[PDB]
Design a protein around this ligand. Sequence first.
Ligand SMILES: [Zn+2]
Lengths: 23, 206, 126, 114, 96, 83, 155, 60
Amino acid sequence: GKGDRRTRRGKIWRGTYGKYRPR
Amino acid sequence: GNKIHPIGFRLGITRDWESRWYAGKKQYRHLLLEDQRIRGLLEKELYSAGLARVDIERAADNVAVTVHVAKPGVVIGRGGERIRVLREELAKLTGKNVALNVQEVQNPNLSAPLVAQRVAEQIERRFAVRRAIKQAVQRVMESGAKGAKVIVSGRIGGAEQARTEWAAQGRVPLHTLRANIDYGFALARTTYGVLGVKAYIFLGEV
Amino acid sequence: EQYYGTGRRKEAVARVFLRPGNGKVTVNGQDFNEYFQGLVRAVAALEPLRAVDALGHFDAYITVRGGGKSGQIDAIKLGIARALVQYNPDYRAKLKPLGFLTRDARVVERKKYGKHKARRAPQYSK
Amino acid sequence: RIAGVEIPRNKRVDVALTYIYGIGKARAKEALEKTGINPATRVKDLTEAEVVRLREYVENTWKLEGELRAEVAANIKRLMDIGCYRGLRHRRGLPVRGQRTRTNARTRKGPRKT
Amino acid sequence: RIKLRGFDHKTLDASAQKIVEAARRSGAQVSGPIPLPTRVRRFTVIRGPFKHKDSREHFELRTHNRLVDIINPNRKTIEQLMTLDLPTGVEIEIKT
Amino acid sequence: PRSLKKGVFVDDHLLEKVLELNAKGEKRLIKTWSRRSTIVPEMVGHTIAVYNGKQHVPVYITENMVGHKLGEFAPTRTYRGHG
Amino acid sequence: ARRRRAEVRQLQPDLVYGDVLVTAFINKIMRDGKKNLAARIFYDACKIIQEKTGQEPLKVFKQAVENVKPRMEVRSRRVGGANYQVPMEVSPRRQQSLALRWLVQAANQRPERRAAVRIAHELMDAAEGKGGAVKKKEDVERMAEANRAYAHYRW
Amino acid sequence: ARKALIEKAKRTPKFKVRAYTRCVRCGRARSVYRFFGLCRICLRELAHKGQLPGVRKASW
RNA sequence: CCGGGCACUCUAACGGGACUGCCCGCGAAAGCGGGAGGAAGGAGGGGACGACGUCUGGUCAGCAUGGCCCUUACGGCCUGGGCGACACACGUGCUACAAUGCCCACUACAAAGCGAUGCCACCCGGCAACGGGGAGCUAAUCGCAAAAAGGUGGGCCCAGUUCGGAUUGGGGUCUGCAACCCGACCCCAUGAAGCCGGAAUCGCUAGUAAUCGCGGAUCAGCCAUGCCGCGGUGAAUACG
Ligand SMILES: [Zn+2]
């Protein structure tokens, strides 16, 4: 869900960047 | 405990700011600071003279100051002595060019602060509060104001039960934006605490 | 020859141009269904060309900015209505009857403090 | 089958690896790369040599089922021994990572007890 | 190139318009006053000093921006440039 | 955790007092306030009463507790249950 | 709702079938204003009904609705110490709403994994006057008919 | 403990992170706007007073 | 992209525009219903605006202030701990319990704001957080910054799951003097409850609800799912 960091969904909701959501 | 402040309600509609000076974020905070000290310093120094308004504009590295007062000589002193004494001490805190100026209060019965200050001094002299109000509102309306109201809150006449007394006269349309309405607050403290004095002077719905 | 209309529908600007021809449609340099691909609603934008039937008559050069595609649609809708009456004032007849030539006043209502949304008051208890 | 457990034949290999304790989505997409195996293949569609290759690779690249759990308990048990606050938290069955014990500690505390 | 920054639009429009007249009197080119978008800066705040978080009040600092530039330098106007009447609610930018 | 690129943080007065006993032989239980400090391998075999906010909790520093902060072992709170 | 009557909104007719009712039935499927998704799911069931029982999807649609449009419904009313259920007629507005609501919800309970099939099966049963949405219309007007003695409690 | 604190905030700390901002007017710690250095209360007060140049009740 | 133009959009100031203005019928009028025009029609939408007073409402901890009260302390400095506990209980929210869905790769489409010791482009390294380079940006021009949902293609096939991310172990980055208590974030693994929720109860009449994302304040960093705003898409229903 939104609260899952490992999903790109999460890093969207969490507003972060990482292995699963680059820039 | 529910109404809005009238002046801020009307800034840039009928009433204008009392400190007009554009500044950047890098300096707006700083110049704002000493602007208060000028309001603070000149307050005590001029209350004896009957201060009304402290307009402060900041030109290039220098603040053109305009005080509105009822006793213009009492501000300047002996032929502008105190004023010359002030801008000395004034710039001592501002550090910039203290352009110190005085402007008479045309019909001082229309200066809600002066109206408030006088009514404060009266009640601070133990005079009849309820009488000072009606008398104060009286000459103001008698001074040509198309409407005026005065309210006082706190321990009235030393009574322990706090109370709010007030007299009104003539139209006082606080809701109407275009009503040129003078507001005046007066901190009036007694031995038995503090009394508040708000002065509403309706002038014109231009 | 060239005929122009504007589109405004909930933050969507739509500059439309009516150059006669076979009815080509361009949205910021793209085909209509091109830029609007996958949009079920994106057929009603060209609807005013069915009130007056110049569908294959006027080639549309259209740009749009701001807001989602949906708002961009109606802006073009109102946009195309503009240049049409620009082309033919008689087109106003049979368009104003369809209200195609009146702007959608509906806009995102301002969000109010004390409210999560424009009117979403937080659930309280007693 | 694999190191300690089996992956369902009807599922793709990617989800297949994940059922191993100590294998999540990350390494699951990795062993396919290091073993060059199609992710889309079902476990029912996996060849022996590919599996044994898979089996040989992954089961030594990491410890997964029992060998992995022991380190956890080893880490956890030693914390109880050292009396660390972390270990202090574990011995109370309380949220060890500074969570708020006053409310919403159910996942660490389970059923509510008036 | 000349920008202007102030809190009032009337003062700016007053002050800026006279500036465009200066080169309009002895210079060129008098690039008209181009009103840039005004950077607004809100301030939500609670009315009361204590609680009642709900009842708020907003504020703003509309720093209106107006820009007039002279195309040709016109150094005769250059002194005319510095010879400007800038009221206290307006600030000036100078470049080209 | 602390950026290992950055140095591994330990208070100066703490470490020096550690090495002093390392110099002058193991002895002299050391009061301390540096809960934020990290145990260092040299600290092993030392005994230190770390301050909890109210008291100095004497904690014997073994090898088993080297890679940690000192505050971990002086619990700054007292809970015994309910009822 | 005291002063005016709060007149209904004029739904924009759908592009495909040029219908407001169709556009109406869309919105009951629409979630979160995700009309594009809901638009397809309808249009997908359009193809399905166009395929399974290949006819006019629109004609099947309206036939489905008319088979499920209720006309008599109970209404709770705490007359005396008894919470009655007065049977009542229905204006075509609420007739359509109840119909549209049921066919969706009945379609929201079939077993098939996707929605447009569920809609397709639903419209198939509905156009056939069968299925839960029909039963609901059957049950309501029956239940509405069960309490016909309470008719005078109407208001 | 206020006056020392509202003076302690003025001096420089042993660590830059200890430098917290109080209202220059009321010395409040919370809701201190960097753009002013004032509390949200003193902001509102001076705002209605019209002393803040440019500031005004925003109503959009 | 450049010359070129200011058309267009926009920007931002000044204006006009909607006033029952006008036609019909109803009424004594007030007005009411309909119509035309009109972008807007009858309070056009939203906002600021909160009367006399009530609540001995709240606040002496924003501030001010009568009085009472401490003066080697109830004052001031420092170090730490506490405010973060935890059997429980309530409120307010967030995330879900999935297929109108989840995940992945590509393509869109905003608004409103912020930024000189800050935005930081772009490069490199690094799974990544991030680090090293490093332009521009003093602001419509530089950047933050990707909007997201959406569309496209693929997988998943109903599964406590490719749902769910809670907890926990480990390995790291960053700020900070210092992230144990007591930060955030990145990576692996762990993968909890949860299959739409009793009694009961809440918000909402339109660009509303719902859902999607964006910005800002405080702030070194952030415990922000909060708050204040911004825009995307976008409902049903009002008989009474
Ligand atoms: Zn303050």
